[PDB]
Design a protein around this ligand. Sequence first.
Ligand SMILES: CCCCCCCCCCCCCCCCCC(=O)OC[C@H](COP(=O)(O)OCCN)OC(=O)CCCCCCCCCCCCCCCCC
Ligand SMILES: CCCCCCCCCCCC(=O)OC[C@H](COP(=O)(O)OCC[N+](C)(C)C)OC(=O)CCCCCCCCCCC
Lengths: 174, 55, 485, 81, 83, 90, 124, 64
Amino acid sequence: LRAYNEEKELALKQRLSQLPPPGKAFVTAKEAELAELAEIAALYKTDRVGILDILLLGNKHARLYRDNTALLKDYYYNGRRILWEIKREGAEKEDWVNQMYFLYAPSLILLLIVMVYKSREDITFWAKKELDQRVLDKHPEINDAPENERDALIVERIIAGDYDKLASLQKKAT
Amino acid sequence: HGPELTPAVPFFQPYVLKWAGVSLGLVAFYQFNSSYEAKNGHTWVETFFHPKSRE
Amino acid sequence: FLTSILLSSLYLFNRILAWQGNVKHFYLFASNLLLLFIVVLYINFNTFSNSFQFNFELFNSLNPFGLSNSDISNGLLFGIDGLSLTFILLTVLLIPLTLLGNWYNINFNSNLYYTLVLAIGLVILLNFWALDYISFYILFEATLPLLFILIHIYGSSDSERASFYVLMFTLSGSLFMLLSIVVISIVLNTTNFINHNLFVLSLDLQTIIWLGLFIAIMVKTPLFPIHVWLPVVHSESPLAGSMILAGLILKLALYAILRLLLPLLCEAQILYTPMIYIISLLTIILTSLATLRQIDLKVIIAYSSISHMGIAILGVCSNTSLGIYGSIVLGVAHGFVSPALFLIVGGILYDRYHIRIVNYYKGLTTYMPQLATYIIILSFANIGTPLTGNFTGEFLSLQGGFIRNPIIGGISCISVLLAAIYQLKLTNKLTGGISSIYMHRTNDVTIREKFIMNILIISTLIIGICPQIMYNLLYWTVNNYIYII
Amino acid sequence: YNAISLIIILPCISWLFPLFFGRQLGYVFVTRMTSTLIIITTLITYYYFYQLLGNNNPINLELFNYLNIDYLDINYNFEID
Amino acid sequence: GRYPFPKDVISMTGGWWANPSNWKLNGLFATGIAVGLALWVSTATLPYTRRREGITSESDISKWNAAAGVWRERHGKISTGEA
Amino acid sequence: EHQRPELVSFDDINYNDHKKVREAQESYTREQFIRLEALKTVRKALEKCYEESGPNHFEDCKNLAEQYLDMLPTHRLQGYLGYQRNDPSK
Amino acid sequence: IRASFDKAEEPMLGDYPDIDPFPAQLKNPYKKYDDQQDRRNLEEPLSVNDDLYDMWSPDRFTHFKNQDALKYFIGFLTIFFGASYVATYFVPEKAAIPREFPYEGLWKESGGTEKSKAFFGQRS
Amino acid sequence: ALFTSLVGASGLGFATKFLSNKIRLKPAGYYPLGYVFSGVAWAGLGLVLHNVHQHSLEVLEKKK
Ligand SMILES: CCCCCCCCCCCCCCCCCC(=O)OC[C@H](COP(=O)(O)OCCN)OC(=O)CCCCCCCCCCCCCCCCC
Ligand SMILES: CCCCCCCCCCCC(=O)OC[C@H](COP(=O)(O)OCC[N+](C)(C)C)OC(=O)CCCCCCCCCCC
């Protein structure tokens, strides 16, 4: 949805043409030559490209841009290591935090929530409801007892009888 | 007098905000489903559980 | 439609390679999309059915490129139960963490490395989907060349010998696995994870078949006769190779002993569980004892992984529902907590100092207090200190092994002691003392390392406080493999 | 007000808060706070002992399931005998 | 003893002699969170409490003993003691 | 909804059909779970007896304690494999 | 060299200097080392099985020989248990009978039924 | 299906054109018309193989 300027980028490339390699551009243990490099760091930081030009443009524009961002990234991080460069604060986003806090972490919390509420659906709750349903099947007179008497009447029926039908299944055994 | 001081620190650090917000949201959501279960007979998340029948 | 999605996606990939040199952003993006897809599959999963829910066939004759709606099926089947989906969830939340784990240390040829790591993760993802013996076996050894290339190009001084051992020992056990798979496919004329409990073989044909599968499992969950490639392939791997290996390959062979052996070798398995108990007690004790004299630091965590897999095997071979469940909890919790330990030794400790000998490291608390916090929390989480998931697995597997044979359960219960001796002997050396005169002070632990650590610690603590959260997948498969007549 | 619950929850507060907020609160605060909270805990348990001398009727609190496997259930259950 | 320390390093439990300037001010927040969490856990675990004795009637346990005798009559199950 | 699927055995069915085999499998499994919650019901009843009884729990629920310890070796998960691979009376 | 296992690993070393093993604790503390804690100079050759002679090794007592101390320890143990067992013969006996119980020794109270009275029974 | 067979065999043709470009130390899309040439050739091989399997199935069903 965003776009860029190409002769900004070619003027950028011939700006970087006369600059030193990044292995000595900061090894000088000042702003005669270290004030033009922090400009270049700040130009690395801002987004030249958007996504609509990525798809519909050809390839040597892309190669131009790729070595541009390679040399610019080099000038940013080597200046950050030796020394915008000359400031100290904490608001910063590294490259992975966009899709690990906003995609990985909510998907993992989603996984937690799906496991917690999927644990309602299990065989022990269903099996206690089925055993209750079976003793209410055989003895419906427990139906018209009041509510907390019903609990213990069910329990005494469970103690008084099998209510499985497991020997029903093993007919070839019997 | 007494103990020597060190510089001031804000209370609500970013990790305090993140961990407190996520766990309070999870407890609030659990209580919301226990609220919704009594009214409608089923959880709000099992609305979204659509597996095929066993047969 | 589905082809147009892919050649849109191939064009997506080509354009972002043309404009960005690296791949790692898209590999992270595809990994987290794969996460969301597997959790959407878990939402639509029916826990009330024992059968295999999301089935698909590849390379059928009527449709070689794509899905199959046919009267006749001779391709490769795929599909899941709860047992498969447990290890799929464990796999899919580890793949982005291993792509993230090497976000800055691989400098020279990065795109090859991240492609190899994501490819290994995808192969092991598809290992748990498979439904034939040949479909399991094809993906089961697709990992090996990628592991060979990964260990050989990237690593320490000795990455040639480690790459050779990871091809050699694995190939050598897995060829005998292929022998037994061929015998199964010529007797039954079907290889299938669906029908295969219905077929009954003769007792001495079963006892011939069972040997070749158990030899490969002895190589890959490394039991005592060959437990031996594992410290060298760990101690000399790169970081994501070590993490993927000890989090997923060992648990893959733990999955294979359930999926491949317990259904159609029941009458063989009962005859052989004393031999498995010999080998598993003997790989708990002797490996847990051989860790006490180790000069290197990643090798200690490799031998730790041996001892924990030896605990898990007498859980699966226990003929008990408790043992099967505890072996699954042990495999998942170990796959959480052990890659965090390999990150402690290989990421926070080898990126900073590039040596791995124990004698340089002393008194790490006074310059790195939260690394030391991590080291002691992970040490206790690895031991069998409860509310961790490791104790749930170790306790239920020791209980099942006590039911099946009480004397080998009695001598297997001392693994609680033996697992703590070497771990705390390492941990108090790393944390305690005056700071080392060899180590110059470096940075404390960074945001991405703390991120990986916090995820791998919360996911052990949730299983450790409540192991019921994944019973809904397993309550069928905990009853499925029991043979108590 | 729940006597069986405060005995559990107040030393957990007294532990978790000095770690998560030690740099933010400092030693002169956290000392008085940790001790203050354990003082309140032990006053509650003296009062509960005084009440159980009245009737020998103990209290337990129940929480969620640790594990439900076939013949074996474990729950987080807490009683003062 | 008040030896010098590096202020480079940040630990969550404080560092060496950690004493921030606004420890009163943060102490009011810690006070509020502690009393609110203790009060909230106190009221949340109220219905999960029960007494040990006096829960169920003795009618219940007499008839459960009777039904256990019923389940023991039908299986012909003999005592511990008679051999 | 509390749905109750039908009960199938391993013995009436042909094993060449898979519908019926899978249902007999799940039937035998769920019946073991019903058996299991019967055992758990008696355990909770017994600890209610012990807590209500105090000192005379030896004689109020001798029979509940004997019932729990008689049910325990026989009321657990046993597995469908052992009955479907082998036929007694053959 | 000095220990038997240090002698046992003698033929496996080649191109390795074969140090005399000396415990790092029994060194002088007052000689200044590069690390005062491990008591070690900076390039000093390490023995084979050096982690048995490190500072982080066992404490390695100085005052008794180990065979002497095993004799003294097993000495004190058999001293106590021998005096314990001979002192059971010189005991005096009781001044009361062990007390008895109503309802035929509370057998119905101790679980029990009439076939099971010897298993769950008291003195009566 | 016939269409999936054709598109997949054309993908095999695209793979062999890509790999032969990259052995030559060329870019990927060096000569973009060789992609359609190779895809049409390998898709024709897929057409042949599909028709032979079809005739084979018809011979197998004529033994009824
Ligand atoms: C390189 C080693 C060599 C090994 C060779 C062995 C074979 C390799 C083949 C490589 C690719 C395998 C993965 C193919 C994915 C196909 C996805 C799929 O089949 O989904 C369709 C399936 C049927 O869906 P249906 O309802 O019938 O309608 C179709 C329209 N969706 O839908 C379903 O029923 C649900 C199934 C969901 C699909 C989940 C698949 C999980 C894994 C996806 C990532 C795997 C990537 C593998 C790439 C590396 C290969 C090892
Ligand atoms: C000492 C170490 C404890 C650690 C505590 C850690 C926090 C957990 C607090 C839950 C207390 C609770 O919500 O419990 C209260 C509820 C209810 O209890 P109920 O009896 O089962 O249901 C009522 C039965 N009636 C009707 C017979 C009375 O619980 C639950 O069923 C919900 C289970 C959710 C557990 C999910 C844990 C996920 C990890 C969270 C931490 C990362």
